[PDB]
Amino acid sequence: APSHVPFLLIGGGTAAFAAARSIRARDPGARVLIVSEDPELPYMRPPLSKELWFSDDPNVTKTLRFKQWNGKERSIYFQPPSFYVSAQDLPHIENGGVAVLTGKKVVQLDVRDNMVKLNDGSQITYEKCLIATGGTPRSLSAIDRAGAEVKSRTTLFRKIGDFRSLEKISREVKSITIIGGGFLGSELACALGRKARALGTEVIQLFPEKGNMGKILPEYLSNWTMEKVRREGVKVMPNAIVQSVGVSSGKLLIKLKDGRKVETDHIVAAVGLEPNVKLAKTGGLEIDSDFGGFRVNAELQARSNIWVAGDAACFYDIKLGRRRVEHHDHAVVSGRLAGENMTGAAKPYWHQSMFWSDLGPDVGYEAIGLVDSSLPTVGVFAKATAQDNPKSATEQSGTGIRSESETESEASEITIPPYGKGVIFYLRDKVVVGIVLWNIFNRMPIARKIIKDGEQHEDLNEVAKLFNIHED
Numbered sequence: 001a002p003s004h005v006p007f008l009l010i011g012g013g014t015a016a017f018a019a020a021r022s023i024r025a026r027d028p029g030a031r032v033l034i035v036s037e038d039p040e041l042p043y044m045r046p047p048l049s050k051e052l053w054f055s056d057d058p059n060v061t062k063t064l065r066f067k068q069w070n071g072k073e074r075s076i077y078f079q080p081p082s083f084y085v086s087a088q089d090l091p092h093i094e095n096g097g098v099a100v101l102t103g104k105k106v107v108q109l110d111v112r113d114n115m116v117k118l119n120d121g122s123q124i125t126y127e128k129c130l131i132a133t134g135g136t137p138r139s140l141s142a143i144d145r146a147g148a149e150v151k152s153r154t155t156l157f158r159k160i161g162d163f164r165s166l167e168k169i170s171r172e173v174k175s176i177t178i179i180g181g182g183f184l185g186s187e188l189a190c191a192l193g194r195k196a197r198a199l200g201t202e203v204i205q206l207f208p209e210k211g212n213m214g215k216i217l218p219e220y221l222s223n224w225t226m227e228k229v230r231r232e233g234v235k236v237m238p239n240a241i242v243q244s245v246g247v248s249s250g251k252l253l254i255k256l257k258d259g260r261k262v263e264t265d266h267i268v269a270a271v272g273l274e275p276n277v278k279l280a281k282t283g284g285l286e287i288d289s290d291f292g293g294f295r296v297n298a299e300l301q302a303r304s305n306i307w308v309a310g311d312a313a314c315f316y317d318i319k320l321g322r323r324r325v326e327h328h329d330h331a332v333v334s335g336r337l338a339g340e341n342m343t344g345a346a347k348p349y350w351h352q353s354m355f356w357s358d359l360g361p362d363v364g365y366e367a368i369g370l371v372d373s374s375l376p377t378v379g380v381f382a383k384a385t386a387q388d389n390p391k392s393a394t395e396q397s398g399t400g401i402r403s404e405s406e407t408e409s410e411a412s413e414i415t416i417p418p419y420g421k422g423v424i425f426y427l428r429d430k431v432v433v434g435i436v437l438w439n440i441f442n443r444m445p446i447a448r449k450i451i452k453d454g455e456q457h458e459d460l461n462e463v464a465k466l467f468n469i470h471e472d
C-alpha cells in the first residue's frame with residue numbers, strides 16, 4: 001500500500017470503476033487507488049443473476065465470460081486486468097494510472113487528517129476521496145436465530161463468490177429455496193429453474209407478497225410474472241411469511257406463519273440491501289435516517305473533499321427528492337460525475353436513474369422514477385412484435401446492459417402523434433411520477449422526459465402510444 005494517493009476510491013465496484021475512468025479521462029496523468037475488500041478486480045453485477053446462468057458454455061465458473069442474449073461473449077470485468085498498474089508503482093509510475101488493492105478493507109476514516117486506515121493497519125492519505133462502498137445484503141431474522149447448520153446452508157447473493165458457490169450447490173443438491181420476490185430473487189428463480197429442469201431437481205421461491213415484485217408492479221403484471229416463473233418449473237409460494245428455520249430429517253425445514261412446512265437443501269436470501277455506512281461514524285459523516293446512506297449535496301459531496309456515489313449515497317433526485325437507489329445506471333452516472341467533481345467540474349447530479357431486469361431472453365422490465373404498487377397506476381398494454389424482448393434489444397444495440405442501450409439522456413420534446421408488452425404510469429394527483437415498461441425498449445429517454453416535465457396528463461392512452469408503437 002502506498003502512503004499517499006491523490007485520488008482514493010473506497011470500494012471496488014461499479015461506482016468506483018466509473019469514477020476512476022472519469023478521473024483519468026479529465027486528468028490523464030492522474031494516480032487513482034481503488035481499495036477493494038474483495039479478491040476480484042472491478043466487475044459488473046447484473047450477469048451474476050442472468051446471462052452467466054443461461055450460458056451453456058463449459059468453464060463459466062472459472063472464466064466468468066458470458067454470452068449476451070444475442071450470442072456475443074463478454075467479460076464480467078470492467079476492463080482487462082492488464083489495464084491496471086500495481087499499487088506499489090502508482091505514486092511514481094510515468095503517466096499515472098489506476099491500481100487496485102484487492103483483499104483490503106478501509107476500517108477508519110479521518111476526515112480532518114485526510115487519511116484512512118485499512119484492516120491490515122496501513123495508513124493512506126488522500127487529496128480527494130470517493131466513498132463507493134455499496135451495500136450489504138439484508139438477512140432474515142428467522143435465519144439469524146437459526147443454528148450454525150442453517151447459516152452455513154444460506155447464501156446472501158451478491159458477488160462472484162456467491163455465483164460460484166451457488167452454481168455448485170445447484171449441481172449437488174435436490175432442492176434450493178429462494179426467499180424474496182423482488183427482481184433479484186425472481187431472476188435467480190428463473191436461473192436456477194433452468195438448471196433444475198436439466199437435472200430433474202427442485203427450486204422453490206417464497207415471499208410475503210401476493211405475486212413476484214408485488215411492492216412495485218401492479219397486481220395484473222405481478223401475477224403474470226409469477227405464472228412466468230412457475231412456467232420455468234419453479235414452485236412459487238406467495239403469501240409466505242417465514243416463522244422459523246430449523247432442521248428436520250436431513251433437511252432444512254422452513255416453517256411459514258400460515259402453517260405450511262417447506263423442506264429444502266439450501267436457502268438463497270434476496271430480501272434487499274443496507275448501504276455500507278460503517279465509515280460514517282469515524283468520519284463524522286451524516287447518514288440519512290429516513291432512506292439510508294450517506295447524505296450528499298447537489299454535487300455528491302459529503303465533505304469538501306469527500307464524495308459518495310452508487311448504492312451508498314443518499315442524494316436529492318431532481319424529481320423525487322432525497323432517495324437512495326440500487327441501480328447499475330446510477331452507480332455508473334454518479335460515479336462518473338463524482339470523478340468529474342474530484343477533478344474540479346462543480347457539476348450537480350441531475351440524472352434520473354433507470355433500472356432494468358430480465359427474466360431470461362424473452363422477458364424484460366424497465367423502471368424510472370417513483371414506482372410503488374400502492375400508488376394509483378394506469379396500465380396500457382399492447383401485443384408484442386418479434387422485437388419486443390430483451391434478446392432483440394440486445395441484438396440491435398450490441399449490449400445487454402440496458403442502461404447503455406437506453407442511453408442516459410432525456411428526450412428533447414413530447415408531442416403526441418395524431419397482452420405481451422406495456423407501460424405502467426404511476427401517479428401523484430394526475431402527475432406521472434414513475435413508469436414501468438414491460439417488454440418495451442429504447443423509450444427510456446421518453447419516459448425520463450414525461451417524468452421530468454411533470455405535466456398533467458389526462459389521456460394516458462395517447463401518452464402510451466409513445467411506448468406501444470415501434471421505436472422505430
Ligand SMILES: Cc1cc2nc3c(=O)[nH]c(=O)nc-3n(C[C@H](O)[C@H](O)[C@H](O)COP(=O)(O)OP(=O)(O)OC[C@H]3O[C@@H](n4cnc5c(N)ncnc54)[C@H](O)[C@@H]3O)c2cc1C
Nearest residue numbers: 011012013014015037045046106134310311326327328331
Ligand atoms: C446479483 C445482482 C444483480 C443485479 N442486477 C441488476 C440489473 O439487472 N439492473 C440494475 O440496474 N441493477 C442491478 N443490480 C444492482 C447493481 O449491480 C448495483 O446498483 C451496483 O453494483 C452498485 O454499485 P456500487 O459501486 O455502488 O456498489 P458495488 O458494485 O456493490 O461495490 C461496492 C464495493 O465496495 C466494497 N467495499 C465495501 N465496503 C468497503 C470498505 N470499507 N473497504 C473496501 N471495500 C469495500 C464491496 O465489497 C464492494 O465490492 C444487481 C445487483 C446484484 C447484486
